[PDB]
Structure 1
Amino acid sequence: HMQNVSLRELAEKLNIYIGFAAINNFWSLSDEEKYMEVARREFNILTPENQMKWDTIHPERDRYNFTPAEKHVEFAEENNMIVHGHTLVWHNQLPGWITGREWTKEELLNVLEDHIKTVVSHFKGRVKIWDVVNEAVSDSGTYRESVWYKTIGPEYIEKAFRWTKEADPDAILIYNDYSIEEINAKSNFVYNMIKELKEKGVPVDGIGFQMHIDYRGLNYDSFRRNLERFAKLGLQIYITEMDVRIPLSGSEDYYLKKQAEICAKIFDICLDNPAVKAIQFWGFTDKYSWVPGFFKGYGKALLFDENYNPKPCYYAIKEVLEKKIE
């Protein structure tokens, strides 16, 4: 009977991880001390929000900068957190050396293999989970027409996973995407995609459900069924970027209560399926979240308020974890 009961302590008892995404340059924020203290007290897995992406780590064709990623990895290792690497292949925020010229298939395959082997071998053994391909599927449930897809065709996805496994055979390799938590056209396309990759022996070890949801919640029965179909492909399941956005106008107490009910229910369903290995939120304090810039009119989507005080959802998830253990 230690005096505080943290999320990470409860996660350790349930053999899962619970954690967060770390903002760029967190160590140099004006409130770095408080941010780092709440993070180390609460969490046992960290994803760098942006500083392992291409624009930061590979800013010119023949230049690599691991300096900010290594700050994230150092903080995680010092505080007994595992690291989730994000992300090796994605369509957005690519540097100008990629977006500003025309590519052929052979040349872009060679670029992608070099990026992936350089980055994954740099952090071999230190990054336990990689998001190898992120968001490859469009919101109609076809392949997203990214630079990678347009130039290479669909084989970019199987090659990215094969190249990542060669460079670190111990990392857990996942495909990560949003709005695939329920059974729908997008998740059906991802399901068949992954089923076909694994039939070909491609090493897709798991699926990441981003869980960027709102105060309307999910169709819980559909999420439960969708988690079961993916687990039965032999996948580990990660909830990778959770946030539960609420409108900024009006009835804050009402929306904080609905946010708590939604987080409680998501945790209940995840803890009932042993394929779910980790639940991370995309940040942890409302002071530092991508939601208000990306979803206009919404925010307050995380576990702690702007002053680092826990919100009703924090107590709600803690209660669920404690009941699951007892």
Structure 2
Amino acid sequence: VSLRELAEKLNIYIGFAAINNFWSLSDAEKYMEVARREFNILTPENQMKWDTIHPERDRYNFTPAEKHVEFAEENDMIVHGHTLVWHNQLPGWITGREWTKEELLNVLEDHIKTVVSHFKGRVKIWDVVNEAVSDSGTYRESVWYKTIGPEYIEKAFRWAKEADPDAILIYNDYSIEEINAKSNFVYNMIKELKEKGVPVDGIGFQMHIDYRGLNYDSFRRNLERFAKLGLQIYITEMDVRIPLSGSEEYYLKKQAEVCAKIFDICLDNPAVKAIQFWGFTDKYSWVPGFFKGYGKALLFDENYNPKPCYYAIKEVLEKKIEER
């Protein structure tokens, strides 16, 4: 039984992030086969981002993203868009010049409406605003915030909902799984947005954690408070990094325990609608390059062979189905 088959029985989605030009990889055939066999939701890792989809002020390139959508549709997967507003990897036409509030607001609205309208009805979930809060519990001083002020967030959501009323719009961020200064800020930010009628349909927890896991009680309580705001919950970029030194056997065992616990807790909260990993094979992962000294954070090894965490997750899913 595949992960997606089990997900269907529990009425949730389980998926991954698709690497750039996955269709032309030297091992594209094997990569795509594992993907279609196991998952029912796909997030383009980079090809829906600004620098790829909107390379010049008046130029739009949907070509790569369309291949991601085509693959998903052909293999019965829904698509998760990523991401409309972010501070990293912005094109030179944005970072290379000074802006005024009015000019950047027009730029932001134009981008959001064009991109969202282009995939209207084909992308079910959109990461509208990504990582807008600093790691100190304050607004991140990005070009958007510094130029426009906090209103860019509320406006991004309203514009996206206008372009596609049926799309589920979410705020996505890292290190906010537990109750802490950062998630507290996010909680108040979203509570306030929804009080004002802003269309924030859900929240996304990236889940970029390590073999040590999380404070599970805090995670459970945090999921509960966000669910009570009337939000759908998504685990969006999960990976459980382990040290590339020491006993791999020991770390993969801890990795499996962590994955099993996260799934156990998520499945117990009906607001969680999907769980995705930021890739699926250790052969293709952003972890080694970002977290020095770490890696082997995914479900399958470099040879596409399932790891301990894969079986652990599957058993948890099967257990939930039986109890129901």
Q: TM class, shorter-chain normalised?
A: over 0.9
Equivalents in 2 of 1:50, 1:118: separation in Å? 18
Equivalents in 2 of 1:210, 1:67: separation in Å? 26
Cα distance, 1:86 vs structure 2: 0.2
> For each residue in 1:146-203, what CA deviation from the matched residue of structure 2 results, as whole angstroms up to 9, or x when unmatched?
0000000000000000000000000000000000000000000000000000000000
Equivalents in 1 of 2:247, 2:222: separation in Å? 33
2:160 counterpart of 1:155: no
> Normalization by structure 1: what TM-score?
0.99
Other structure's SS at 1:258 match: helix
> For each residue in 1:47-96, what CA deviation from the matched residue of structure 2 results, as whole angstroms up to 9, or x when unmatched?
00000000000000000000000000000000000000000000000000
Equivalents in 2 of 1:177, 1:256: separation in Å? 26
Other structure's SS at 1:221 match: helix
The CA RMSD over aligned residues, in Å, is 0.4
Cα distance, 1:98 vs structure 2: 0.0
Cα distance, 1:226 vs structure 2: 0.1
Equivalents in 1 of 2:71, 2:216: separation in Å? 36
- 1:1-326 aligned at under 5 Å gives the runs 5-325=1-321
Other structure's SS at 2:103 match: helix
Cα distance, 1:216 vs structure 2: 1.0
Equivalents in 1 of 2:151, 2:247: separation in Å? 49
> For each residue in 1:193-246, what CA deviation from the matched residue of structure 2 results, as whole angstroms up to 9, or x when unmatched?
000000000000000000000011000000000000000000000000000000
Other structure's SS at 2:136 match: coil
Other structure's SS at 1:217 match: coil
Cα distance, 1:306 vs structure 2: 0.1
Other structure's SS at 1:192 match: helix
Structure 1 unaligned runs (5+)?
none
Percentage identity across paired residues of the two chains: 98
Equivalents in 2 of 1:305, 1:43: separation in Å? 17
Other structure's SS at 2:275 match: strand
Equivalents in 2 of 1:216, 1:21: separation in Å? 23
Other structure's SS at 1:313 match: helix
Equivalents in 1 of 2:75, 2:3: separation in Å? 14
Equivalents in 1 of 2:11, 2:167: separation in Å? 18
> For each residue in 1:71-128, what CA deviation from the matched residue of structure 2 results, as whole angstroms up to 9, or x when unmatched?
0000000000000000000000000000000000000000000000000000000000
Cα distance, 1:249 vs structure 2: 0.6
Equivalents in 2 of 1:249, 1:100: separation in Å? 41
Equivalents in 2 of 1:35, 1:131: separation in Å? 25
Cα distance, 1:30 vs structure 2: 0.1
Structure 1 consecutive aligned stretches of length 4 or more whose deviation exceeds 3 Å: none
> Normalization by structure 2: what TM-score?
0.99
Structure 2 unaligned runs (5+)?
none
Cα distance, 1:250 vs structure 2: 1.2
> For each residue in 1:227-282, what CA deviation from the matched residue of structure 2 results, as whole angstroms up to 9, or x when unmatched?
00000000000000000000001100000000000000000000000000000000
Equivalents in 2 of 1:219, 1:188: separation in Å? 16
Equivalents in 2 of 1:320, 1:304: separation in Å? 17
Equivalents in 2 of 1:15, 1:280: separation in Å? 14
Equivalents in 1 of 2:106, 2:137: separation in Å? 28
Equivalents in 2 of 1:95, 1:145: separation in Å? 18
Other structure's SS at 1:183 match: coil
Other structure's SS at 2:183 match: helix
Other structure's SS at 1:263 match: helix
Equivalents in 2 of 1:45, 1:250: separation in Å? 34
Equivalents in 1 of 2:309, 2:16: separation in Å? 15
Cα distance, 1:297 vs structure 2: 0.2
Equivalents in 2 of 1:251, 1:184: separation in Å? 32
> For each residue in 1:273-298, what CA deviation from the matched residue of structure 2 results, as whole angstroms up to 9, or x when unmatched?
00000000000000000000000000
